[PDB]
Design a protein around this ligand. Structure first.
Ligand SMILES: Cc1cc(C=O)c(OCc2ccc(O[C@@H]3O[C@H](CO)[C@H](O)[C@H](O)[C@H]3O)cc2)c(-c2nc3ccccc3s2)c1
Ligand SMILES: Cc1cc(C=O)c(OCc2ccc(O[C@@H]3O[C@H](CO)[C@H](O)[C@H](O)[C@H]3O)cc2)c(-c2nc3ccccc3s2)c1
Ligand SMILES: [Mg+2]
Ligand SMILES: [Mg+2]
Ligand SMILES: [Mg+2]
Ligand SMILES: [Mg+2]
Ligand code: NA
Ligand code: NA
Ligand code: NA
Ligand code: NA
Ligand code: NA
Lengths: 1021, 205, 202
């Protein structure tokens, strides 16, 4: 009767931050309770650790009070059969909610809507007699969102909160031999939801592994592994503290051995009994074993050397009771004289933020996706990962241990939507709920060498509980620095200045919580700490503008030790249209209101882990080989701290305007932090016109655990020589003829005709034989389809006037009509010259003037000169160029300039000057929110169908007009228009991306000059 | 000195609950709720995290909590050797003036020697000294000579004020002063409840 | 039904250091709720802060499970009239224990003896309708040793621990005009007693 829903639900433990668990067992590092120690040493399956993953029974309810009493005793008939782990939103039982800062529930702590979607999970399963005759059988829920009560065979077992750490209950007194039934009631909302306001999809359910674990009643209850070192890391001591539960007897002993492969490195044995620690003595139920290790192989992201520690609990006559084990990484993390050191060397953090997200499975993680993520990170020169913003699936720490990534392990506390952010974290009544999210994280993950920094959470202001839990970590685990960004990124609760979206040079002096220039921040009086941005370079849509500005600063300033990009993956989810074709959805696409629309997609990769163009810009700026060139001598500098270049060649190409002249390979032999000089063989020196370019790639000839053979890890380019063309063009056999109507200037030469409209003043049409070439005239364009960074948080409902898109719209940029001022024709000796002048106006104000000359000569070549004025007091325009819709649709695009991938003025360092030839499909970037895309800059020649354009321009070319892209909110609703839209710009504004809620394009990349000039030639082939 | 209601003296070791994160909730409410009630009283000059409970990580957490929420008062705590990371004052109990008692882990140095240990910056104020159990306070003069000579010796608190004797009545209802065991309580520590400068009725010793 | 001793005592909240209070209000400096600024300036008595000190009804029990359900609905005939505040050991109901270091109970945290002396305190008292028509009426327990459950008019209000700091509960929705009855069940031992091992009389 005390097990009835009526009694258990009436206490309302999910609306009370004083009750975060009932009858829950203590946290600890991962256990398998092996009963053979060779099994433990090789990490083979334990037959004492069963999985309960698979088909469970599930039934949804609008509120826990709606659940019938019958569900404890017996399976509900209208229930469904369902795979666990899962998020019940991903099965369609209610909507996932995407909201950023605003809580998805009324802010009224600690209370929760009476409308509280409840997930009723049931499982009927078998248990051997062996597990009930001796020992302790427990159940382990690795992740339950957001709180739950647990029944077993109709009797009540316990209650748990915190959605991203494992909850364990003792089931021994509840299970019978044979058939048993678990009953798990999961609540979407609980008082814990107030500390779980991360900017992510809000889902729920049993979304991580469920397991049964058998241990003997006399058991290893906890174990801690530390590694001390001497000054030069030539000697280490491994200290291993082992705690036990159950009856202490004098015959009990512990052995801990250290293996590296099948070599035993050290071993020690002791009975239980610790040092005297205070006046009452010591821990009779603990022992610490110290093993010596001479010349230990050290752990790093560059070389993840692992040992394995085996902890045997046995009797003195040798009988094994049980064994536990963990991977060991010999590494030291200290902050010394303002620098974060790993093994005595200052790290430079090539980091990213990574959520647990899958476009199909939601927040359920799998080995294949974790490994795919770690490979893609390591292949793009990433060093480290921030668990934003909760403890991860346990397997993640093991994969970073072995593949080699530095992990920031972050507590599951975010109170972003509270006003002020400080509200709960400064309140002592929330210290208990917060302490268990911090302490239980450390208890579980404190043996992973991949974990180098503890984080107290994300965006929860700065409360006195932060200071309390900061000191708790320092006391319990000095091994690792503690960091936290909240309350101005330099509070007393952080060892590291960890700002989010601090800019390189410009201050953002917000009251109470300013973001100083990261360079200025370091020099503030009394400030001694390193600075590592917890989040920088917001990669929402077409972004990572100015990425190179950060990395130049990181390399120049010792105490700037890098940062973590926001973020790794688009939090897109999959929906199916009427035919069952999938499309990527975002905020509001599930009926979820209110919602924050595109803001869930901030990744360097799409949800299917296809890279965005920004990923290579990251790969290039984060590379571990820096280059200089003086003469034909290359200085290679290694930014590796621990390894030589023992898997690296340097390939080199010399090419003249795309044409390769000379090649070669040189072996790379650079010490960590060292230099190697390479003299190149006599390079080609042609008197030919054009730019001579040297290109070097670094190539890993041998496969790694994380890369294939021939993987490219770094590159650089230099212009060697240029020879200006001085040869006169070949004369023509014919003079182009001008025909003058009242309405048009038309020009004929051979099979070619050019039509100029004298009312509009534009090139209206062009003929090669009978075949017309244009569907839309060639007109100036001063606008682009707004990028996420141009929109910011502006919406139709609540406009932000300071966003770029709004300043443009308010100034009439997007609705400005061209007014023809001048349209004249002249006949010269060898050519016809059309001169034009338009003014673009909006409600009486002249925004732009464009003066052109079109010069069509005997060779069938149209030379266009453009001279634009921009009013000093209108907002600086998005671009300055022309655009037309071509009739042609060709299958290939061929250009000489920066590529091969999409590149913009403040994001073109990774791009390389060469001849690029791609399919037209690859000239469009399928951002889920459509915008301006697919630009390539610094291009001298563009070829498409019969057309050639030469000059010095930036272009994009697609089946999608800037107008369609602007007016369309998802990529899956775009339709190919007739023909091909071509944007050729003399000048194009930066894309920004330091953040995406305020203007972030830096002045040097704004079009503020006032007068602009550019020159094209349009050609037939 | 406003002291939190935390003492875990009988644990083995004294550290057992105060170093356990599962007891940090119970312990934080006894520290935080004290500060919230008594923070406005000028007579309170120093907060104390409790008494004789070893030195656990929960002590370091709650030390920093008080510093953050009330910087106007130092924090002291004697547990775990009187000079832990959770005390702004060296507050030993029964540290002698000239003689060292070098107990393992938790030594009671000479108060004069204690000041000059390498890296030791803090004042020293004995949270308890001169145990006043019956005929005692021998050598009390030796403390005050040392207190006056040494600037960083800033005194102490005598243990203690009142005999904790209770009145009992015999078969005919005569009152008499009772101590440990006089109520059938077993086990007990007999006389050791009477440590006062004054008798329970406030008569001076 | 979920106010019965059977249900509330079932949870054994005194043997669980994850539950040190239920429905207890936040702590704060001393309040009097003066409705005249001169009274507050001169620290004179406040008509909005009354004492419930005086003659209460009390009954001793060897264990909380020995307390009859009767006691929440109705005063026990077997009970005695006793003055509050008081320690029930000073009235002769059981022995005060003097132990220095060794705990007076078996060291087995967070558990305490099944034989756990419980004091059942009740008081019948009047509340003027003035207090219930507007505003918040709370009860303040400046000190209760070791832990307690509180009933008002048979309905359960909350639970509290820490023997040396005030426990306050909102009683506004529990009180009726005229005669009201508080039922206070005080446990000698609780998980809180593990943190209350001061060398003094227990
Ligand atoms: C209420 C509030 C909070 C913060 C935050 O403190 C904030 O400034 C930074 C910020 C951080 C995270 C964020 O949302 C996401 O959160 C994710 C998960 O954590 C990732 O961390 C990413 O950072 C991110 O995509 C959004 C904004 C602003 C500001 N608004 C405006 C608007 C206009 C002009 C100036 C400002 S200043 C307001
Ligand atoms: C486990 C343990 C703790 C402590 C303590 O740290 C201790 O030595 C100091 C002590 C402190 C208080 C105390 O009891 C009273 O308790 C009161 C209220 O709490 C006040 O604290 C007063 O201080 C006090 O009169 C009694 C002894 C000893 C020692 N045992 C022995 C026995 C023989 C020889 C040397 C030693 S050393 C062991
Ligand atoms: Mg709760
Ligand atoms: Mg946030
Ligand atoms: Mg309790
Ligand atoms: Mg004591
Ligand atoms: Na640097
Ligand atoms: Na976002
Ligand atoms: Na090499
Ligand atoms: Na002095
Ligand atoms: Na004493």
């Amino acid at each position: 009767i005390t097990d009835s829903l009526a009694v258990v639900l009436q206490r309302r433990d999910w609306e009370n931050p004083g009750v975060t668990q009932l009858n829950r067992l203590a946290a600890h590092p991962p256990f398998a309770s092996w009963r053979n120690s060779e099994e433990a040493r090789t990490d083979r399956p334990s037959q004492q650790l069963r999985s309960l993953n698979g088909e469970w029974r599930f039934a949804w309810f609008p509120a826990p009070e709606a659940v019938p009493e019958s569900w404890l005793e017996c399976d509900l008939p209208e229930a469904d059969t369902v795979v666990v782990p899962s998020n019940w939103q991903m099965h369609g039982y209610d909507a996932p909610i995407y909201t950023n800062v605003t809580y998805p529930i009324t802010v009224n702590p600690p209370f929760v809507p009476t409308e509280n979607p409840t997930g009723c999970y049931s499982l009927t399963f078998n248990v051997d007699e062996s597990w009930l005759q001796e020992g302790q059988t427990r159940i382990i829920f690795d992740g339950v969102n957001s709180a739950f009560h647990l029944w077993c065979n109709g009797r009540w077992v316990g209650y748990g909160q915190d959605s991203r750490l494992p909850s364990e209950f003792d089931l021994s007194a509840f299970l019978r031999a044979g058939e048993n039934r678990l009953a798990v009631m999961v609540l979407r909302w609980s008082d814990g939801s107030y500390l779980e306001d991360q900017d992510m999809w809000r889902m729920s359910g049993i979304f991580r592994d469920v397991s049964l674990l058998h241990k003997p009643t006399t058991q290893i209850s906890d174990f801690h592994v530390a590694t001390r070192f001497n000054d030069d890391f030539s000697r280490a001591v491994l200290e291993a503290e082992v705690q036990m539960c159950g009856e202490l007897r004098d015959y009990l002993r512990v052995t801990v051995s250290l293996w590296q492969g099948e070599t035993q490195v050290a071993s020690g044995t002791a009975p239980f009994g610790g040092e005297i620690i205070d006046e009452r003595g010591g821990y009779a139920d603990r022992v610490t074993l110290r093993l010596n290790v001479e010349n230990p192989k050290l752990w790093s992201a560059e070389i993840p050397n692992l040992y394995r520690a085996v902890v045997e609990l046995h009797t003195a006559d040798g009988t094994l009771i049980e064994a536990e084990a963990c991977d060991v990484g010999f590494r030291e993390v200290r902050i010394e004289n303002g620098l974060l050191l790993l093994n005595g060397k200052p790290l430079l953090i090539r980091g990213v933020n990574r959520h647990e997200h899958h476009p199909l499975h939601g927040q359920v993680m799998d080995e294949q996706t974790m490994v795919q993520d770690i490979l893609l990170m390591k292949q793009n020169n990433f060093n480290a990962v921030r668990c934003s913003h909760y403890p991860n699936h346990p397997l993640w720490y093991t994969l970073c241990d072995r593949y080699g990534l530095y992990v920031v392990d972050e507590a599951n506390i975010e109170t972003h939507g509270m006003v002020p952010m400080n509200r709960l974290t400064d309140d002592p009544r929330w210290l208990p709920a917060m302490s268990e999210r911090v302490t239980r994280m450390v208890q579980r993950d404190r043996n992973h060498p991949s974990v180098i920094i503890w984080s107290l959470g994300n965006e929860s202001g700065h409360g006195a509980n932060h200071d309390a839990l900061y000191r708790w970590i320092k006391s319990v685990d000095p091994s690792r620095p503690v960091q936290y960004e909240g309350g101005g990124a330099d509070t007393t609760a952080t060892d590291i200045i960890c700002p989010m979206y601090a800019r390189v040079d410009e201050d953002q002096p917000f009251p109470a919580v300013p973001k100083w220039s990261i360079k200025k921040w370091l020099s503030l009086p009394g400030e001694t700490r390193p600075l590592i941005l917890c989040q920088y370079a917001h990669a929402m849509g077409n972004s990572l503008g100015g990425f190179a500005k950060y990395w130049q600063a990181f390399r120049q300033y010792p105490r700037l030790q890098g940062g973590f990009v926001w973020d790794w993956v688009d939090q897109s989810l999959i929906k199916y249209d009427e035919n069952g074709n999938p499309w990527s959805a975002y905020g509001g696409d599930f009926g979820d209101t209110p919602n924050d629309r595109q803001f869930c997609m901030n990744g360097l990769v799409f949800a299917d882990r296809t890279p965005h163009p920004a990923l290579t810009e990251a790969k290039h700026q984060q590379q571990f080989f820096q280059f200089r060139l003086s003469g034909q001598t290359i200085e290679v500098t290694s930014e590796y701290l621990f390894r030589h270049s023992d898997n690296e060649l340097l390939h080199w190409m010399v090419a003249l305007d795309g044409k390769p002249l000379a090649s070669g390979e040189v072996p790379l032999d650079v010490a960590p932090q060292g230099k190697q000089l390479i003299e190149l063989p006599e390079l080609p020196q042609p008197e030919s016109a054009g730019q001579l370019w040297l290109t070097v790639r670094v190539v890993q000839p041998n496969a790694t655990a994380w890369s294939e053979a021939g993987h490219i890890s770094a590159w650089q380019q230099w212009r060697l020589a240029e020879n200006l063309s001085v040869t006169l063009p070949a004369a023509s056999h014919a003079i182009p003829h001008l025909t003058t109507s009242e309405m048009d200037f038309c020009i004929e030469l051979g099979n070619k005709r050019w039509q100029f409209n004298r009312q509009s003043g534009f090139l209206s049409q062009m003929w090669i034989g009978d075949k017309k070439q244009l569907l839309t005239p060639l007109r100036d364009q001063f606008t682009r389809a707004p990028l996420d960074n141009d929109i910011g948080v502006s919406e139709a409902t609540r406009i932000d006037p300071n966003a770029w898109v709004e300043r443009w719209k308010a100034a009439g940029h997007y609705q400005a009509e061209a007014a023809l001022l001048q349209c004249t024709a002249d006949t010269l000796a060898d050519a016809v010259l059309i001169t034009t002048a338009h003014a673009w106006q909006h409600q009486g104000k002249t925004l732009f003037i464009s003066r052109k000359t079109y010069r069509i000569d005997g060779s069938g070549q149209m030379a266009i000169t453009v001279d634009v004025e921009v009013a000093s007091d209108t907002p600086h325009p998005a671009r300055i160029g022309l655009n037309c819709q071509l009739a042609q649709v060709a299958e290939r695009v061929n250009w000489l300039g920066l590529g091969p991938q999409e590149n913009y003025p403040d994001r073109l360092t990774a791009a390389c000057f060469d001849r690029w030839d791609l399919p037209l499909s690859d000239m469009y970037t399928p951002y889920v929110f459509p915008s301006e895309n697919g630009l390539r800059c610094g291009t001298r020649e563009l070829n498409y169908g019969p057309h050639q354009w030469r000059g010095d321009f930036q272009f994009n070319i697609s089946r999608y007009s800037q107008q369609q892209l602007m007016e369309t909110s998802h990529r899956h609703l775009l339709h190919a228009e007739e023909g091909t839209w071509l944007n050729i710009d003399g000048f194009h504004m930066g894309i920004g991306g330091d953040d995406s809620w305020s203007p972030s394009v830096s002045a040097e990349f704004q079009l503020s000059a006032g007068r602009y000039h550019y020159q094209l030639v349009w050609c037939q082939k």
